[PDB]
Nucleic acid binder design. Structure first.
Ligand SMILES: [Mg+2]
Length: 1566
RNA sequence: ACACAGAGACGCCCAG
RNA sequence: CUGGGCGGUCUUUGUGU
RNA sequence: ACAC
RNA sequence: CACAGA
């Protein structure tokens, strides 16, 4: 630990060098903490020190024993003194010794230790310590130290003799170290250990006396005093709590904390559970008696075959037992008409008779065509002339007709649902309605799907390159890519245009246009017998539409002449059409609002799929080949999932992951993928579902027969024999892993019908009927064979003690006294305005409890800011002032008063719980306490987001350190089932009260007791229909149970008669107690870790195995990693058997804590582990790129045309950092461009040609023009970078220069006319002169509110914010946004800071002749603060502009790699908000002295020269009228750095290296 | 056609 | 069985990061 | 965008 | 004047 040795390995070159910083974790094991006795005297602070326990943990050599004194005047820096002693031997120096005198007042600063080497270099080191657990605090301290001295050093680096100076920073915390100096892990560990000692000393010293610390600010002192008074004076009426809520005796907590654990009971139970787990292992894995590996695999195959046949036979008995069907998976025709110019060519004039005698559809279509040919055509094709007139100078006219249909044709239509409510009592309708409820047989003949998936023609070229829609897209793309004109861009554009002419994309284009037509026509209405006829705009296809109500189905039938169908998609998966002579017709299918999204997004989805799988198979995006049939299978499967769009199919595909991860299990265990048949049964309703289930069962038996081969080709580990789960084709690991996520193409945002809420209610109440009768094992005593909800007190206390051990070992032996202070501070500092959010709250009370009184009323939810505004207007400012009344209200009730709804997710059947105001207020405090406690835990990853990347990676270094090279790693990924609903809440209350300072005990106990009488409100329409029918007659038991409970036949415990709600005592809810559940899981993991370590220490037969144990856990996911080191091949088998036994008993020990292990746990896999959808295959971290690629169209509604590109950029960056190469990301962006122009009206509006030809001359964002990125850096740089680079090459800054000098001498479209927002503002009653009031008192924008009026102004400003502006937007963004493409370029929709887009383009072009000058740098800074790094990066990317390179045999070492591409420039050291507030008001917000800040103030003056010390005079000089935008721009000017993390080989050279490598995998660009 | 181990939707409101 | 109306229409969006 |  | 910094 020597400063000379530290400095002797610094490669100083040229003048000042500022080497890149780096981070060190707490990787190595640390010994015990020595004894510390502290007595603080007026003479000084006297400390005695024991001795560090000597072991094979040499860490702790710098600590010496004996008595140490510290003076009282210097006792406020014990942390900084004691940590860095030993690196201090020659005192402190000034900026005068080795540096000259520049006569500026900066001569005199003392930078810790200044050292000059024998060569003559000068290296200055600076030290800092921080008590901040997150890495943000270390980053902040590092930055403030590196900005305190950089100017005084770069000032004198020019006077002296051609200097070579290095500036060094070392920042030390309890967690880690951030230093830009070279350093060793051991040096880091030593510094952190010393800091732990020093902080313990400081805490003990500051405890006894009270003058050691310096002065806390008045705001902090007030906050702590306020919270402490609240917790001293809070009395929650424990007698009433015991009377009201069940199992709420405080005696339970007292006895839990007083009675110790029963160690004899613990060890006896541990022996019993080990024996039971060993017996289960031998029985279920056929280990005894004495069979070989193939002889056991041959039995495993037989068992899997038996289970599969049993499941098939079970499902077949509940079907209609049919073996052939006539359904089709794709409900759309296979037509591929050639796109041509537009004219209504129906006048075949011979088809008007051949249609008339072909059936009901023939009659309908003949009537329609005859009426159109006789009559007018308005509505069928939109009129350009009148629309152009209205644009230059929104009810839309549609063509409606009433055919004279007969009763036979009407009945035949109604069989398909067209007007089937008035025909629902006939014979055929009732028969078909009964027959629609049956499920298919597992033995149905689905081979058309099997042939289609391999032998289609989806990827064939359609030869439709030179058509209208292709020409439009190509024109816009070339204009967008004109500025970055290079051979690279030309190659990628040519590849995209090749993919745009394939058969599937040509199909998806007209499918998407039809879906957009339906989305627009959803909101119309028709009378009885009315229909709507439409043409399809570049395609000769006619559609008849029957809308009902826009919240229900819409029916459509398609018609095309046979001469126009040039080509067809081949296959037998399509529904069959009607031949009517010269026409083809279709039989009235239907759609909904929620099922239109996939059809709108289909062309872009198919384009992305083609590009992605071509990249994954190794085909470069500039070569032309033939499809390899694996490409066909993957793309066809994507197609079929997208078009079918059903939850069951998505769920059958998703489960393949858990059956195929079972092939990584190593000996002595067998792969058992047959445990996933528990989730596989259920009703089958489509042929595609039958096919997928059969393929999945084949995959299961194949995996059970043979595991994945593990071969050491280099020392790195690679697996062989992998395959696609559905196709069965052999592949590699990455393609197999990505194949598990194909089901994510199904539309997540799915409408739930009222038919399917019983499943959610069933999942909620399935455990309540199981609650134990006696409360003995709910916290009082010990049991060894626990029931469903019970747990053992001794084991709970053992786990708590173990986690406390680890907490003390990391944070020192006074962690509780620091935790108390942190919790008091964070409770006292909060106000109501922090709570007031845009979030739903329940109105359910004791007025909606009786369905007799409810029927006429309609239940609605409110938003949280309404109730919070009520509180603020009452006279409540602080959260402490609100909890006291919220709890009293809750205790006056006896309920929790929840309402429910369903979540949209790619998972299962997740339900959502919504609370009310008082419940939210009470829960806030306990959640903040639990979060503060979880932030200390060293293996929890909810309060520590870096630990989910740190632990797994550092395990290898720790194992190498403690065992040497060549060690076997053995893992276990664990998942928990019924996580919520398995937890009784007394458990969480006890575990949280174990870790808290005993003044919070009563509040925590009373706050958590209220979860034991919940009342959840069911849906009123569901209740109406359930009350309509007295008897249930259903085969599912839950239906009749609910009916009889609500009507009073039987008695269940969760529903009363005539009520509107469901009661439940057991179980927490999903997400309400996130941190408490995480803390409990951390305690359990710590118990397992100590247990495994002790077991390894006393190995088999008494000999000791040497090993390393690592654990990690979140909320319900966890992982265990063990590394062993055996001596010989005889020892290896027995050590691995011992480890397998150790990892197998987790599922047997879990029930003791109230946790149940799921069937999705992959136990005993050697060189792999998965924790949170991240798959660590030895040294080949894999992510599923397909998950984020399938979500690159989920845009937001936005408000301005120029904020759509920001959303597209966010999605693109997600895709790139998910593991996509730059060329792939550029192709994804081409697809996003097509999506943007389609929502702007490409396939709807007739005037898009004129608008596009008039925009291609004036390429401006916010007039709809799309800006493309550079292919070499596709996703790295954002929209601001693209705008900056576009204003400097084409005529945009020219336009901006017109707009600038006209100011010195943005085209919003509203969606609802702000009706809901305006009504929300009307109920609040806020002052409308708030702008004037904050103009006359500006302290509200920088200083936290201090009275009711200022808090009112704070809220009033908050509720006019851009964030609050768009939150009343409901779901299904794509249909609602694409519906407005009908009235976009021709109606008065924009209010520029109303007119149509054509009109605004005309105004801008009329100003295009007065355009003057290009942009100037001084205000280029004002528009773009980061305008220097932009030029540096733009200049770096011009070396790569061609398509020359070589294919290299790729190395396989994949890791996250952070890239900083835009840094922070050299401005005033602080933030502008901080500095301005500091000078303008009395607020010590910035961290500089009194003589300081004058330099920063004068340097800030250079940018403006009008800014002054007075806010009032400052306001009247600048170009800003009001402080409300003054503050906005002050926050804006502080520029933000952009950083991106990547996937690739470990690594301004970084930018060039990633540009070279990650253009295409295995290709070295230039 | 959608939803569902048969709980729903297939238009609603007003005036005649 | 005639006429007139029906959109940011609610369903619908919880806790954390 | 991820989890619960 | 210069120090330390949840
Ligand atoms: Mg897991």
């Amino acid at each position: 630990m020597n400063l000379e040795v530290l400095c002797g390995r610094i490669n100083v070159e040229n003048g000042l060098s500022l080497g890149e910083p780096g981070l060190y974790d707490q990787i190595y094991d640390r010994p015990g903490l020595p004894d510390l006795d502290v007595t603080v005297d007026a003479t000084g602070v006297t400390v005695d020190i024991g001795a560090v326990p000597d072991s094979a943990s040499q860490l702790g050599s710098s600590i010496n024993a004996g008595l140490i004194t510290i003076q009282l005047s210097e006792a406020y820096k014990i942390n900084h003194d004691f940590t860095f002693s030993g690196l201090s031997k020659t005192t402190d120096r000034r900026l005068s010794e080795v540096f000259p005198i520049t006569h500026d007042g900066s001569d005199g600063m003392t930078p810790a230790v200044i050292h000059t080497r024998l060569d003559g270099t000068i290296v200055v080191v600076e030290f800092s310590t921080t008590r901040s657990h997150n890495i943000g605090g270390l980053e902040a301290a590092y930055r403030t130290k590196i900005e305190k001295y950089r100017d005084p050093i770069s000032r004198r680096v020019d006077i002296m003799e051609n200097p070579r100076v290095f500036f060094g920073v070392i920042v030390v915390s309890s967690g880690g170290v951030l230093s830009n100096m070279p350093l060793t892990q051991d040096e880091a560990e030593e510094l952190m250990y010393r800091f732990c000692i020093a902080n313990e000393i400081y805490t003990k010293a500051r405890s006894m006396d009270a003058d050691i610390e310096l002065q806390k600010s008045e705001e902090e002192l007030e906050a702590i005093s306020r919270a402490l008074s609240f917790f001293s004076l809070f009395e929650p009426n424990i007698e009433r709590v015991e009377g009201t809520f069940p199992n709420s005796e405080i005696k339970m907590l007292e006895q839990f904390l007083s009675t110790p654990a029963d160690v004899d009971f613990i060890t006896k139970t541990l022996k019993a559970k080990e024996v039971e787990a060993y017996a289960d292992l031998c029985d279920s894995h056929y280990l005894k008696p004495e069979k070989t590996i193939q002889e056991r695999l041959e039995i495993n195959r037989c068992e899997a075959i038996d289970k599969t046949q049993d499941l098939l036979a079970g499902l077949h008995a509940r079907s209609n037992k049919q073996t052939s069907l006539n359904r089709g998976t794709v409900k759309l025709p296979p037509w591929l008409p050639k796109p041509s110019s537009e004219s209504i060519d129906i006048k075949t004039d011979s088809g008007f008779g051949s249609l008339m005698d072909h059936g009901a559809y023939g009659e309908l279509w003949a009537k329609c065509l005859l009426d159109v040919s006789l009559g007018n055509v308005e509505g069928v094709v939109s009129d350009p002339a009148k629309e152009l007139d209205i644009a230059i100078s929104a009810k839309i006219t549609y063509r409606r007709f009433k055919p004279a249909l007969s009763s036979s044709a009407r009945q035949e239509f109604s069989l398909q649902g067209v007007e089937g409510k008035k025909w629902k009592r006939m014979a055929a309708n009732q028969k078909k309605e009964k027959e629609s409820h049956e499920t298919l047989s597992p033995f149905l003949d689905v081979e058309d799907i099997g042939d289609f998936l391999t032998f289609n023609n989806l990827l064939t070229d359609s030869r439709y390159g030179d058509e209208s829609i292709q020409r439009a897209v190509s024109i816009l793309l070339e204009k967008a890519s004109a500025m970055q004109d290079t051979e690279l861009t030309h190659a990628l554009n040519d590849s995209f245009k090749r993919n745009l002419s394939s058969n599937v994309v040509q199909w998806s284009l007209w499918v998407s246009c039809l879906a957009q037509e339906l989305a627009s026509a959803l909101k119309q209405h028709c009378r009885a017998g009315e229909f709507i006829i439409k043409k399809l705009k570049f395609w000769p296809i006619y559609v008849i539409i029957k809308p009902t109500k826009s919240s229900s189905h819409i029916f459509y039938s398609l018609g095309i002449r046979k001469a126009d169908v040039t080509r067809r998609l081949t296959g037998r998966v399509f529904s069959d059409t009607i031949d009517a002579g010269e026409w083809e017709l279709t039989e009235f299918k239907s759609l909904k609002t929620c099922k239109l999204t996939n059809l709108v997004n289909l062309p872009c989805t198919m384009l992305n799929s083609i590009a992605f799988w071509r990249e994954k198979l190794g085909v470069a995006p500039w070569l032309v080949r033939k499809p390899c049939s694996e490409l066909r299978e993957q793309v066809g499967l994507t197609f079929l999932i997208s078009l079918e769009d059903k939850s069951k199919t998505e769920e059958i595909i998703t489960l393949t992951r858990y059956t195929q991860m079972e092939g990584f299990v190593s000996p002595p265990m067998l792969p058992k993928p047959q445990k996933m048949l528990g989730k596989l049964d259920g009703p089958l309703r489509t042929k595609l579902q039958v096919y997928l289930l059969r393929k999945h069962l084949d995959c299961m038996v194949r995996i059970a027969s043979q595991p994945f081969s593990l071969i050491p080709r280099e020392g790195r580990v690679e697996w062989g024999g992998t395959f696609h789960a559905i196709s069965g084709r052999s592949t590699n690991l990455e393609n197999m892993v990505n194949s598990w996520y194909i089901g994510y193409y199904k539309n997540k945002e799915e409408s739930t019908e009222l038919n399917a809420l019983g499943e959610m209610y069933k999942k909620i109440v399935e455990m309540e009927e199981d609650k134990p009768s006696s409360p003995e094992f709910l916290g009082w005593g010990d049991t060894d064979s626990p029931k469903k909800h019970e747990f053992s007190r001794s084991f709970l206390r053992a786990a708590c003690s173990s986690l406390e051990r680890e907490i003390a070992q990391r944070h020192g032996r006074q962690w509780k006294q620091n935790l108390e202070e942190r919790v008091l501070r964070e409770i006292g500092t909060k106000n109501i305005l922090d709570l007031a959010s845009m979030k739903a709250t329940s109105n359910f009370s004791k007025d909606w409890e009786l369905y007799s009184e409810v029927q006429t009323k309609e239940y609605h939810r409110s938003k949280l800011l309404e109730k919070m505004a009520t509180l603020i207007e009452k006279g409540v400012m602080w959260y402490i002032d609100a909890v006291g009344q919220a709890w009293k209200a809750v205790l006056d009730d006896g309920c929790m008063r929840i309402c429910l709804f369903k979540k949209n997710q790619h998972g299962g059947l997740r339900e959502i719980y919504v609370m009310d105001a008082n419940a939210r207020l009470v829960q806030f405090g306990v959640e903040t306490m639990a979060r503060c406690v979880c932030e200390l835990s060293p293996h929890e990853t909810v309060a520590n987001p870096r630990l989910k990347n740190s632990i797994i990676e550092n395990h290898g270094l720790k194992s190498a350190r403690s065992l040497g090279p060549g060690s076997i790693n053995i893992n276990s990924s664990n998942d928990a089932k019924k996580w919520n609903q398995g937890h009784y809440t007394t458990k969480l209350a006890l575990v949280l009260c174990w870790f808290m300072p005993a003044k919070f005990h009563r509040f925590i106990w009373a706050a958590i007791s209220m979860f034991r009488r919940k009342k959840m409100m069911v849906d009123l329409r569901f209740l109406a229909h359930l009350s309509s029918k007295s008897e249930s007659r259903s085969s599912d038991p839950f239906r009749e149970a609910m009916t009889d409970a609500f009507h009073g036949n039987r008695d269940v415990s969760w529903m009363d008669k005539g009520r509107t709600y469901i009661k439940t005592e057991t179980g927490m809810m999903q997400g309400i107690l996130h941190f408490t559940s995480s803390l409990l899981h951390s305690c359990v993991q710590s118990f397992y870790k100590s247990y495994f370590v002790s077991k390894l220490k006393e190995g088999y037969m008494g000999e000791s195995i040497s090993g390393v144990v690592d654990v990690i856990e979140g909320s319900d996911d966890s992982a265990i990693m063990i590394s062993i080191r055996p001596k010989s091949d005889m020892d290896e088998v027995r050590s691995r058997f011992f480890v397998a036994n150790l990892l197998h008993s987790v599922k047997f020990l879990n029930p003791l804590f109230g946790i149940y292990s799921s069937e999705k746990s992959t136990v005993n896999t050697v060189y792999c582990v998965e924790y949170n959808s991240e798959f660590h295959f030895h040294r080949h971290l894999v992510r599923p790129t397909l998950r984020w690629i399938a979500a690159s169209h989920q845009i937001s509604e936005t408000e301005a045309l120029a904020s759509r590109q920001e959303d597209y950029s966010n999605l693109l960056t997600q895709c790139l950092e998910g593991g996509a190469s730059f060329s792939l990301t550029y192709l994804i962006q081409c697809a996003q461009l097509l999506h943007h122009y389609m929502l702007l009206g490409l396939c709807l509006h007739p005037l898009f040609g004129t608008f596009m030809g008039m925009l291609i001359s004036d390429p401006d964002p916010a007039l709809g023009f799309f800006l493309m990125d550079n292919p070499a850096f596709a996703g790295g740089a954002g929209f601001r970078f693209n705008l900056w680079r576009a204003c400097k090459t084409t005529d945009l800054g020219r336009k901006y220069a017109y707009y600038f000098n006209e100011i010195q001498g943005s085209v919003m479209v509203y969606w609802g006319d702000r009706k809901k927002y305006q009504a929300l503002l009307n109920r609040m009653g806020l002052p409308e002169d708030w702008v004037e009031q904050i103009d006359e008192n500006p302290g509200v924008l920088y200083r936290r509110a201090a009275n009711k009026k200022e808090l009112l102004l704070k809220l009033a400003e908050k509720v006019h914010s851009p964030g609050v502006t768009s939150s009343l937007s409901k779901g299904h963004v794509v249909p609602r946004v694409v519906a407005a493409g009908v009235y976009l370029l021709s109606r008065h929709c924009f209010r520029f800071s109303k007119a149509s887009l054509i009109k605004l383009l005309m105004m801008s072009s009329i100003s295009a002749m007065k355009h003057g000058g290009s942009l100037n740098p001084n205000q280029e800074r004002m528009l773009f603060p980061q305008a220097q790094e932009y030029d540096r990066v733009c200049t770096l990317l011009e070396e790569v502009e061609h398509l020359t390179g070589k294919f290299v045999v790729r190395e396989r070492n994949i890791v996250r790699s952070r890239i900083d591409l835009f840094q922070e420039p050299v401005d005033l050291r602080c933030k502008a908000e901080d500095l301005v507030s500091e000078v303008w008001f009395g607020l010590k917000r910035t961290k500089l002295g009194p003589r300081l800040l004058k330099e920063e103030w004068d340097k800030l003056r250079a940018s403006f020269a009008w800014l002054s010390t007075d806010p009032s005079e400052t306001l009247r000089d600048g170009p800003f009228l009001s402080h409300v935008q003054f503050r906005n721009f002050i926050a804006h000017v502080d520029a933000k750095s952009r950083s991106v993390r990547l996937l690739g080989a470990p690594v301004v050279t970084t930018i060039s290296q990633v540009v070279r490598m990650n253009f295409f995998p295995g290709f070295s660009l230039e």
